[PDB]
Amino acid sequence: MASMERFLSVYDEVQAFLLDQLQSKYEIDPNRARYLRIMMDTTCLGGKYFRGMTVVNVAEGFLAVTQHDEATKERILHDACVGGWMIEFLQAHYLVEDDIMDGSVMRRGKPCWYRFPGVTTQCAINDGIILKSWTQIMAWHYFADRPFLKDLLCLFQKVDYATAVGQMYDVTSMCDSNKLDPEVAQPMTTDFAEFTPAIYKRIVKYKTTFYTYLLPLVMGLLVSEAAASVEMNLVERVAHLIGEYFQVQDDVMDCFTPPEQLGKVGTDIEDAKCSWLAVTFLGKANAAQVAEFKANYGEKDPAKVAVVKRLYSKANLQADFAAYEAEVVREVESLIEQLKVKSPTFAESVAVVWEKTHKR
Amino acid sequence: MASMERFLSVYDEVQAFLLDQLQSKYEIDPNRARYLRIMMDTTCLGGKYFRGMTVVNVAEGFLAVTQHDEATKERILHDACVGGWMIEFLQAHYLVEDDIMDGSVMRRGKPCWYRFPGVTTQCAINDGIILKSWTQIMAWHYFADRPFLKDLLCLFQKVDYATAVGQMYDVTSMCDSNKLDPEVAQPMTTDFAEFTPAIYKRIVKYKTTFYTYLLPLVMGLLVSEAAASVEMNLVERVAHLIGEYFQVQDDVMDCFTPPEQLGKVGTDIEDAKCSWLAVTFLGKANAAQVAEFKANYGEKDPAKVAVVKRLYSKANLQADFAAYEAEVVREVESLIEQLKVKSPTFAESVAVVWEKTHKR
Numbered sequence: 121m122a123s124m125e126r127f128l129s130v131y132d133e134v135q136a137f138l139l140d141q142l143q144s145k146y147e148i149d150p151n152r153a154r155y156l157r158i159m160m161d162t163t164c165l166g167g168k169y170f171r172g173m174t175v176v177n178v179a180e181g182f183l184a185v186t187q188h189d190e191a192t193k194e195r196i197l198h199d200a201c202v203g204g205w206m207i208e209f210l211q212a213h214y215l216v217e218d219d220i221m222d223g224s225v226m227r228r229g230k231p232c233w234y235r236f237p238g239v240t241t242q243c244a245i246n247d248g249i250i251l252k253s254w255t256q257i258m259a260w261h262y263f264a265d266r267p268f269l270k271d272l273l274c275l276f277q278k279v280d281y282a283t284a285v286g287q288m289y290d291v292t293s294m295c296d297s298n299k300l301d302p303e304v305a306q307p308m309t310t311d312f313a314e315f316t317p318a319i320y321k322r323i324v325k326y327k328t329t330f331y332t333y334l335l336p337l338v339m340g341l342l343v344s345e346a347a348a349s350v351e352m353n354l355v356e357r358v359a360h361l362i363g364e365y366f367q368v369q370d371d372v373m374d375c376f377t378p379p380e381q382l383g384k385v386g387t388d389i390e391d392a393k394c395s396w397l398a399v400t401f402l403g404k405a406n407a408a409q410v411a412e413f414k415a416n417y418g419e420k421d422p423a424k425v426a427v428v429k430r431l432y433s434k435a436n437l438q439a440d441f442a443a444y445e446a447e448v449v450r451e452v453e454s455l456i457e458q459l460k461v462k463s464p465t466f467a468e469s470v471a472v473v474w475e476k477t478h479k480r
Numbered sequence: 481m482a483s484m485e486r487f488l489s490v491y492d493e494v495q496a497f498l499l500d501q502l503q504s505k506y507e508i509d510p511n512r513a514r515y516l517r518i519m520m521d522t523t524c525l526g527g528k529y530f531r532g533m534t535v536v537n538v539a540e541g542f543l544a545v546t547q548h549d550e551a552t553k554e555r556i557l558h559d560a561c562v563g564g565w566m567i568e569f570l571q572a573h574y575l576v577e578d579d580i581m582d583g584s585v586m587r588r589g590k591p592c593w594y595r596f597p598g599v600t601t602q603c604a605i606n607d608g609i610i611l612k613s614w615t616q617i618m619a620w621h622y623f624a625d626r627p628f629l630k631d632l633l634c635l636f637q638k639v640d641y642a643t644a645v646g647q648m649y650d651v652t653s654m655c656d657s658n659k660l661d662p663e664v665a666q667p668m669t670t671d672f673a674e675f676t677p678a679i680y681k682r683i684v685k686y687k688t689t690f691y692t693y694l695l696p697l698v699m700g701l702l703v704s705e706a707a708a709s710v711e712m713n714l715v716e717r718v719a720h721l722i723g724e725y726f727q728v729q730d731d732v733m734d735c736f737t738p739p740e741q742l743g744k745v746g747t748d749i750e751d752a753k754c755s756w757l758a759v760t761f762l763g764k765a766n767a768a769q770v771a772e773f774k775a776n777y778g779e780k781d782p783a784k785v786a787v788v789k790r791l792y793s794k795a796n797l798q799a800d801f802a803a804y805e806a807e808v809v810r811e812v813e814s815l816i817e818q819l820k821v822k823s824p825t826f827a828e829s830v831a832v833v834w835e836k837t838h839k840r
């Protein structure tokens with residue numbers, strides 16, 4: 121069986137399980153099941169499945185070097201697929217809620233879920249809640265007797281919580297820290313003093329890297345009973361590194377990738393986000409460039425947004441991006457080597473994860 | 481130590497733990513810790529703690545009839561307090577998200593969290609996410625080596641998921657089921673055919689009873705290692721019963737309790753909710769009363785809202801409420817008796833829970 125065919129098959133299995141359970145146990149009616157089925161499909165399907173398929177790829181790597189009965193290979197692959205779907209549904213939860221929080225319009229060339237006419241914000245907030253709740257149902261059902269259940273649920277919780285804290289760091293990145301106050305409406309920074317590489321790194325570490333890279337790699341190790349083939353501090357190090365690079369690419373595309381190709385209209389400039397471009401720009405700008413940036417950033421006026429894109433465009437940020445890229449290539453290749461001391465297999469999966477990231 | 485003093489003390493402990501953890505492990509800064517501290521206080525504190533204190537009361541009941549070392553009594557009481565706070569934070573999550581979903585204004589005489597000037601919807605959605613995430617952190621930290629950890633986390637998940645499904649039943653209660661469709665903007669019912677006692681019961685079972693009554697009673701049993709002193713089917717039966725009664729009281733107050741005493745302006749009529757009053761009214765109305773209700777319900781116009789309150793007011797719904805009340809008294813007293821076959825203690829705690837409900 122090709123990996124993706126298996127993974128998609130398991131989607132249909134898990135869907136059927138969750139919807140059947142809602143009928144036998146939760147008194148649901150056919151029509152509300154249908155709404156939830158459509159919600160699931162709409163929010164979970166249509167991506168590349170990178171996160172979920174990484175769990176499967178990591179487990180296939182170990183299968184090739186470990187002795188097992190055929191039924192045990194099938195159980196491991198089925199558990200890798202379940203776990204990969206947990207991650208995909210977790211991502212779905214955050215995309216639905218983020219889209220609502222950020223007033224987003226489109227995602228992937230289609231309207232955000234909350235914007236569907238028969239959804240609305242009132243239902244979509246709860247739909248997003250349900251998406252994450254289904255991750256737990258999956259785990260307690262498919263993994264009920266498994267040795268790794270405890271470790272997987274603990275890992276998933278820590279990853280979820282890091283991700284929520286990263287959303288907080290992200291949405292507050294354009295405020296001055298010393299002015300955060302629930303009682304007082306929050307003004308945009310005027311000094312941009314908190315637009316630094318270290319602050320940027322913290323936002324991205326927490327908002328994306330844990331769920332996108334750490335969790336799929338560690339989940340693959342757990343369903344394989346292979347956590348002893350790695351040094352976990354190295355797996356954390358390489359996940360945070362590759363994950364940062366991924367987000368830098370995403371920041372640059374928000375600004376410069378045509379909307380029809382990006383799948384949405386990028387608004388990081390108007391939203392005053394602490395993006396890689398803003399930080400890198402401030403890190404090399406002269407005084408008049410910093411002042412022009414300040415007069416124009418975080419405004420909806422398209423003329424000001426164009427002034428920002430022009431400043432970025434003339435500041436030779438491609439050079440800074442290639443220098444960054446070169447350094448990440450260098451460091452990820454060193455970590456991959458440190459990962460061979462214990463597992464060629466796992467180091468190769470990390471290599472594949474890097475290749476898929478680097479060359480998109 | 482009085483129970484409430486202990487419970488409040490443990491709040492301060494748990495708060496300190498979560499905020500310290502955010503500093504040592506999650507790279508938080510003092511200012512964002514302070515925002516989260518204020519958020520926690522604002523959303524978790526200020527109620528009666530009924531839910532959390534039930535866990536403590538149930539565990540105190542068992543302590544009085546079970547032999548233990550004093551350190552073991554202290555550990556049980558501390559675990560009951562932690563678990564009670566998990567429930568209180570879970571309720572906080574749902575109140576924050578519900579308030580956003582329903583466009584609520586006030587809760588308990590203060591603005592809803594999302595309406596604070598330095599919060600907004602963008603941050604409050606995520607704050608609510610964090611509230612529930614903190615329930616998990618509590619459990620994995622305080623209960624890490626406890627025998628009941630697995631059973632508690634499984635119970636809490638099922639309760640959370642039931643509650644989300646109940647929010648779905650609630651927010652869609654005024655739509656015709658056969659017209660639910662994410663693609664099509666949802667019209668209000670015109671026939672009210674789905675405003676039935678059985679449909680009402682399903683909404684309330686799921687939206688309130690599991691977290692308000694089932695979970696505190698079962699959590700008390702689990703931290704006490706006492707689940708064998710009960711027949712779980714009876715504990716489910718009595719929790720769903722008392723919980724329904726609680727929600728009927730809440731529905732009647734939304735309509736008839738003065739705003740300054742209710743702590744908010746009740747809008748169930750304007751929101752077209754499937755309330756006890758609407759259902760009970762339709763269950764006795766003549767044809768002209770049903771038609772007047774239909775012409776007036778689910779509208780913001782205060783004159784129409786007054787027409788609805790007038791219809792309810794002339795339909796002798798107090799009689800139906802006393803008849804309901806009498807039947808619930810009767811049935812809960814029968815269940816309490818069935819609960820003595822195994823535990824006087826637990827049956828008394830259920831009695832107290834009922835007294836606190838019935839006489840508010």
Ligand SMILES: CC(=O)Nc1ccccc1C(=O)NN
Nearest residue numbers: 372376377432433437438441
């Ligand atoms: C078209 C494109 O992909 N990028 C740019 C265009 C204009 C200015 C800067 C960049 C850039 O990448 N900066 N790092």
Ligand SMILES: CC(=O)Nc1ccccc1C(=O)NN
Nearest residue numbers: 732736737792793797798801
């Ligand atoms: C003042 C009050 O608490 N209740 C009513 C007032 C007017 C009409 C009906 C009721 C009622 O309770 N119905 N069950």
Ligand SMILES: [Zn+2]
Nearest residue numbers: 218221222290
């Ligand atoms: Zn966002």
Ligand SMILES: [Zn+2]
Nearest residue numbers: 370371374388
């Ligand atoms: Zn982006």
Ligand SMILES: [Zn+2]
Nearest residue numbers: 578581582650
């Ligand atoms: Zn609501």
Ligand SMILES: [Zn+2]
Nearest residue numbers: 730731734748
């Ligand atoms: Zn109410």
